[PDB]
């Protein structure tokens, strides 16, 4: 800054990754340091509410109500705007079972059915399955034996 003090972005923050060591500067506040990058297993995903509207890497606009779902074996890169709500393991589904679910908000499910709030539906698919950010896990439902 013209005063000779370093200029500051104030309310804005600053994420960092791997680089050569750097001096801290006056007026800075180190909220965070030294942590392995957010690793994630293939059969689990990150649930991520926006704090405020922001640009996406793909050019997509992001509403504050939007819920990101980062699935797959990887290491997610945090944004100062992105907030980490939680983590959800994918639900395994053994043969002859169905994954009961509920709609916490109006939307479309992977089945493609229109989903009014409070609606419930089966998940026919066998094997591991990841619930959607609106989808809520309940229980596996075994098929009744029929001799």
């Amino acid at each position: 800054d013209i005063t000779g003090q370093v200029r500051l972005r104030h309310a804005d923050q600053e994420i960092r990754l791997a680089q050569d060591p750097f001096p801290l500067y006056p007026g800075e506040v180190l909220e965070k340091d030294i942590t392995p990058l957010q690793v994630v297993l293939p059969n689990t995903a990150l649930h991520l509410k926006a704090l405020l509207d922001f640009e996406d890497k793909n050019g997509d606009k992001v509403m504050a109500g939007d819920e990101w779902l980062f699935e797959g074996p990887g290491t997610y890169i945090p944004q100062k705007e992105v907030e980490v709500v939680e983590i959800i393991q994918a639900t395994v589904i053994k043969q002859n079972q169905a994954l009961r679910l509920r709609a916490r908000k109006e939307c479309f499910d992977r089945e493609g059915k229109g989903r009014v709030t409070g609606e419930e539906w089966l998940v026919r698919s066998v094997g591991a399955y990841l619930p959607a950010v609106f989808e809520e896990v309940l229980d596996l439902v075994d098929a009744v034996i029929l001799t």
Binding site: T3, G4, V6, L24, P26, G27
Partner: peptide, 22 residues
């Protein structure tokens, strides 16, 4: 004291009172 030996991977936030800035 007036003498300040800075180690190669180290830093200090000096506060100049004349310009009233760090």
């Amino acid at each position: 004291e007036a003498i300040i030996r800075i180690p190669p991977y180290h830093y200090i936030h000096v506060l100049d009172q004349n310009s009233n800035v760090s």
